[PDB]
Design an enzyme around this catalytic site. Sequence first.
Site, PDB file in Angstrom:
ATOM      1  N   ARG A   1       0.814  -1.229   0.000  1.00  0.00           N
ATOM      2  CA  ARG A   1       0.000   0.000   0.000  1.00  0.00           C
ATOM      3  C   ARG A   1       0.842   1.272   0.000  1.00  0.00           C
ATOM      4  O   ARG A   1       1.744   1.406  -0.828  1.00  0.00           O
ATOM      5  CB  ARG A   1      -1.013  -0.072   1.164  1.00  0.00           C
TER       6      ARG A   1
ATOM      7  N   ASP B   1      -2.509  12.493   9.405  1.00  0.00           N
ATOM      8  CA  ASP B   1      -3.926  12.211   8.975  1.00  0.00           C
ATOM      9  C   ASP B   1      -4.611  13.562   8.854  1.00  0.00           C
ATOM     10  O   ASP B   1      -4.639  14.342   9.826  1.00  0.00           O
ATOM     11  CB  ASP B   1      -4.603  11.291   9.995  1.00  0.00           C
TER      12      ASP B   1
ATOM     13  N   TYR C   1      -6.673   5.757  18.173  1.00  0.00           N
ATOM     14  CA  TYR C   1      -6.014   6.060  16.875  1.00  0.00           C
ATOM     15  C   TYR C   1      -5.824   7.587  16.699  1.00  0.00           C
ATOM     16  O   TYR C   1      -4.725   8.078  16.388  1.00  0.00           O
ATOM     17  CB  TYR C   1      -6.842   5.488  15.701  1.00  0.00           C
TER      18      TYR C   1
ATOM     19  N   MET D   1      -5.835   9.968  19.003  1.00  0.00           N
ATOM     20  CA  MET D   1      -4.813  10.410  19.997  1.00  0.00           C
ATOM     21  C   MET D   1      -3.376  10.176  19.503  1.00  0.00           C
ATOM     22  O   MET D   1      -2.469  11.034  19.675  1.00  0.00           O
ATOM     23  CB  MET D   1      -5.052   9.681  21.320  1.00  0.00           C
TER      24      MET D   1
ATOM     25  N   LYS E   1      -2.339   9.845  16.331  1.00  0.00           N
ATOM     26  CA  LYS E   1      -2.023  10.752  15.253  1.00  0.00           C
ATOM     27  C   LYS E   1      -1.823  12.188  15.704  1.00  0.00           C
ATOM     28  O   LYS E   1      -0.957  12.891  15.180  1.00  0.00           O
ATOM     29  CB  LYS E   1      -3.080  10.673  14.152  1.00  0.00           C
TER      30      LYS E   1
END
Lengths: 251, 251, 251, 250
Positions: free
Chosen positions: C13, C144, C157, C159, C161
Amino acid sequence: EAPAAVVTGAAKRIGRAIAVKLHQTGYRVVIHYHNSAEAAVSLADELNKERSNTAVVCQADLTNSNVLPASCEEIINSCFRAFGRCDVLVNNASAFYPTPLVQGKTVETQVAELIGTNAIAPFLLTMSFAQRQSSNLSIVNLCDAMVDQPCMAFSLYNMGKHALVGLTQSAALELAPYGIRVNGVAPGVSLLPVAMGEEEKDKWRRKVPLGRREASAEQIADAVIFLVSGSAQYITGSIIKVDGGLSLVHA
Amino acid sequence: EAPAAVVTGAAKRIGRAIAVKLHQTGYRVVIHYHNSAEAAVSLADELNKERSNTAVVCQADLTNSNVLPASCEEIINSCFRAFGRCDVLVNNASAFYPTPLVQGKTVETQVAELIGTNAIAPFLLTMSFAQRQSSNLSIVNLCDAMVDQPCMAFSLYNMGKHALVGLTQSAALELAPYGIRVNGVAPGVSLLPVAMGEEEKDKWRRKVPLGRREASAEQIADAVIFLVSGSAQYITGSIIKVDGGLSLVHA
Amino acid sequence: EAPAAVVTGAAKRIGRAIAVKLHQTGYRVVIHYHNSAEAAVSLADELNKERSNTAVVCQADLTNSNVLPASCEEIINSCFRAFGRCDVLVNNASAFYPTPLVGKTVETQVAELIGTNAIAPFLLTMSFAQRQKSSNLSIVNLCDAMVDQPCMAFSLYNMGKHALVGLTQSAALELAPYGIRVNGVAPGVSLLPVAMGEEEKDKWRRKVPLGRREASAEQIADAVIFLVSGSAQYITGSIIKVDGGLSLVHA
Amino acid sequence: EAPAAVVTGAAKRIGRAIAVKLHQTGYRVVIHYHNSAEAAVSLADELNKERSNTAVVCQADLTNSNVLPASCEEIINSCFRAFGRCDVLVNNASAFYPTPLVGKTVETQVAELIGTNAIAPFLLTMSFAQRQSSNLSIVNLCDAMVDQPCMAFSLYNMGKHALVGLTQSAALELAPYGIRVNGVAPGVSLLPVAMGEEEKDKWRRKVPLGRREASAEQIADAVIFLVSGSAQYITGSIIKVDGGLSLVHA
Ligand SMILES: NC(=O)c1ccc[n+]([C@@H]2O[C@H](COP(=O)([O-])OP(=O)(O)OC[C@H]3O[C@@H](n4cnc5c(N)ncnc54)[C@H](OP(=O)(O)O)[C@@H]3O)[C@@H](O)[C@H]2O)c1
Ligand SMILES: NC(=O)c1ccc[n+]([C@@H]2O[C@H](COP(=O)([O-])OP(=O)(O)OC[C@H]3O[C@@H](n4cnc5c(N)ncnc54)[C@H](OP(=O)(O)O)[C@@H]3O)[C@@H](O)[C@H]2O)c1
Ligand SMILES: NC(=O)c1ccc[n+]([C@@H]2O[C@H](COP(=O)([O-])OP(=O)(O)OC[C@H]3O[C@@H](n4cnc5c(N)ncnc54)[C@H](OP(=O)(O)O)[C@@H]3O)[C@@H](O)[C@H]2O)c1
Ligand SMILES: NC(=O)c1ccc[n+]([C@@H]2O[C@H](COP(=O)([O-])OP(=O)(O)OC[C@H]3O[C@@H](n4cnc5c(N)ncnc54)[C@H](OP(=O)(O)O)[C@@H]3O)[C@@H](O)[C@H]2O)c1
Ligand SMILES: Nc1nc(N)c2c(-c3ccc(F)cc3)cnc-2[nH]1
Ligand SMILES: Nc1nc(N)c2c(-c3ccc(F)cc3)cnc-2[nH]1
Ligand SMILES: Nc1nc(N)c2c(-c3ccc(F)cc3)cnc-2[nH]1
Ligand SMILES: Nc1nc(N)c2c(-c3ccc(F)cc3)cnc-2[nH]1
């Protein structure tokens, strides 16, 4: 054919660096200027010696007034008249001076110049650019990495640059269905003002974590060239800081 | 000697609630209006019934023009005339409508109204407020929680509100040595436009995580009252969202 | 001598695309993986076919634990053992799944989500920097774009990032004296999970202003390549959104 | 009946002023502490002398570990045990020290700085929500300088960023239960115990609004606002209480 770009305030300094780098990348350029006629003509001469018929100048005051929309439409028209297309708009031209809240120009003139050049003209140029439209169309706005830690007594200038962030985001959203990307580049300390003495320049230089020096014009232009390139084809609404960490430094 | 406050656009809706809640707290108030003379007077009547000679009205267009600085000076003056002091300025008046980038007000009239009411008038009022100055002096600017996820085709309005955030921060910095605090309140969905379709209103209501409803005008005013209070005396340059989580909700 | 880069989670990916573009640009690469050994090896063999001895793999769990610091040191040490140098670190590996507030224990979820998205990047950054102290050293963290409009029930998740943005800024400041630049790239919707139904992929694609489609892995990789390049030599502490305008879209 | 609040790290300084102020407003309080046992018990004595049966103490290490969820559950449980309800959670406890990138192990520094500033708030939020007229809310003590961080404080900064994320995520996810989640972000308030006049005055002169640090009571005032009936539409918001510090360029 080669694509074509309009760069506002392109006679010298960062705007020249952007026009030169776009030209080196293969663009035909419109060199907009206000007062710097000799410099703008000398730049177009150099570019045209490198590739004939690839640079033209376009004079306009970007102060807000009732004729500013016509002036902005004419700038875009100048690119279509010269080159038959307009692929890229770089909103670089900017008035910059203090406007203290508590105590030459009347305040309404200060509003017109500082908000006109930094925000209203980019808005009207963006309207005209969009209205006149393989393709890789985009706009890049020169913003300011220090908008949230502003220089003392520069409220109208700071207001202007915030509005320009707003524009970048609003126009990115609204022009996306037309494939026009809208992004910004935000210097921190780059070329210092010509009037500034070296001692005061060094004070600013010493604030910058990455090398204790200002960004070159070329370093600013590099981020512009990235955003207009095919390497940024999914990027819209983004503002890239080019500040060497300056905005991260506390008081 | 009760403190005194100027509230712009105070005849109706959120501005009215703010004026009422300041009055209920002990302030004397200047109710500024543009077109809503009957409402402004009716409000002043209700307030003066409660406490005699504690509410006056002041008419002004806050569209940017050659006369806007004089109009803003006179708003501030009207507070000093009626009450002998001016402790609080609330910048609430705001034009709001779409200005699409791509296609009977001209675009420059749209600039003058949307940028004038949301940003230039607040700047000029801030200047006049500061020049004319123990005490608890402060300014509260009505911003917008959705500035970074703007409504489609509202570029100028969004530019205006971004400029107002810039003014909030710049003025907080510059006026702090005078003990003048400068802060913001940023609604999400509060009182929906009178014109908007009831089914449209519910679509916006359903987006709000906290309660699936709009803020009341009083709920917005509540944050204003906090900011002007003695319990916010170390707060300046801060913008308090009052949005029920709306700005946190992804597309 | 060819420079060298570590890419975490590079088997598939987005990490794979990053490793491939770095290799195409002239880097030697360490392909870190956790469970995807066969994909990692297939990539290394493909790259070494292009240029012999230019790709190695390295296995590690980046979950937080007593041994994570050692594992992170060893990843960095593998690049030096293989290639004699380590110029670029890309923190890309990431656990991602919901952790609602109301068979893995919660402390395992904390260890995995905070470990991979934040703690491992920090320990890798320490090790990268300790082993340094012409050259263009930099770190790029995969952030993100939707960090302020988070997915429902993804608190740990999100938190992680956010902590990663903090590290990007803190490390940019601290490492700037060593000439190490630290930046991020923030995808919005890129490659959707493999098993997700197309009808659900489409709900996300339809949210993206610019083309109503997800970013390719190569598009994300392009921004990484810019940040590591000689064209970004003044850029540090900056996070480039590559999101097609998704983060500007209100609920 | 009186509402009840948990305040973490409430023995001293800012947490103490928050607990005192909530108590003055009518709340029963759990005074959480770690090492400051004497100061904690002293505070609960004072409060209970004002109104009987309105303050308890609760000891806990909020370092991250496999038992932190139990410790956090127990803090919340202590509020229900003493008071039959839990209306407000204030996440105030915080470790703070440099962790440069170039005598505690690094995994201890991770555990302490990320645990106290982020993981413990998350677990306390989980426990608070799971145990639930009413006006339920959480207030997280964040940091106004989170985007202009102190040099060599990466783990601390990472913690406080994660705490912003938690504030937003929990505001979103808990809104359907009527639980509001917000933050208060000091700039410079009560200066460390170890710090000289020169260094204290160095920080003081940076503050535009008065060239002084916030009092503890000024921080508590913003907390009180956010838990009040005057903030019932506010969730996911972080209020800077910094006298303009974060607006000042380098
Ligand atoms: N230099 C920095 O450190 C720095 C830092 C932060 C942001 N930026 C941003 O980067 C951009 C370039 O900075 P710079 O220092 O190169 O800019 P600059 O030299 O201050 O201004 C660039 C040009 O703006 C044009 N301009 C000014 N007033 C105008 C008007 N009323 N109508 C039309 N044009 C007008 C001028 O053209 P003529 O000379 O032809 O009259 C001038 O050459 C600006 O947007 C600036 O705000 C720069
Ligand atoms: N309602 C919301 O959901 C919402 C959401 C986000 C932000 N806000 C902000 O909160 C504030 C109040 O919102 P609102 O909905 O109460 O505002 P509004 O009803 O749209 O406007 C308030 C008043 O602004 C005055 N005004 C408009 N144009 C003017 C001009 N050219 N000169 C002088 N005054 C003018 C008008 O006074 P007259 O009636 O006397 O002409 C009007 O009553 C605004 O700043 C708004 O941007 C509101
Ligand atoms: N795809 C998107 O739309 C999107 C959106 C926003 C942000 N991002 C960010 O961009 C990056 C790449 O996204 P992606 O979708 O390509 O990622 P992904 O496929 O979800 O994960 C990348 C790799 O992370 C590694 N990883 C997971 N858990 C691990 C653990 N405990 N220890 C070590 N490695 C572990 C895995 O390696 P193995 O397969 O070898 O086990 C996995 O292949 C991530 O940081 C992500 O958060 C992506
Ligand atoms: N002071 C400032 O200028 C400032 C600036 C920005 C942000 N803040 C934030 O505001 C809040 C209060 O600041 P403050 O200066 O009053 O805090 P502080 O005195 O540094 O710490 C408050 C309490 O946290 C507790 N604590 C530390 N480590 C712990 C652990 N492992 N387990 C459990 N509790 C632990 C301690 O409890 P015991 O004493 O009982 O051991 C301590 O009294 C903090 O969240 C802080 O990050 C403060
Ligand atoms: N149009 C324009 N010209 C400029 N020189 C600037 C600067 C700038 C930035 C740092 C400095 F010390 C002096 C000015 C900041 N923003 C600017 N805009
Ligand atoms: N001056 C002013 N008036 C308003 N009605 C608004 C709104 C608003 C916010 C939500 C909505 F559905 C419609 C309008 C948002 N911003 C505004 N500003
Ligand atoms: N490690 C990691 N993997 C991912 N697949 C993601 C995504 C993502 C983004 C959109 C979506 F529908 C599903 C996941 C968002 N963030 C991610 N992080
Ligand atoms: N738990 C905790 N304690 C603190 N003392 C702080 C500070 C702080 C802020 C300013 C200063 F000069 C020293 C420390 C900043 N953030 C903190 N967190």
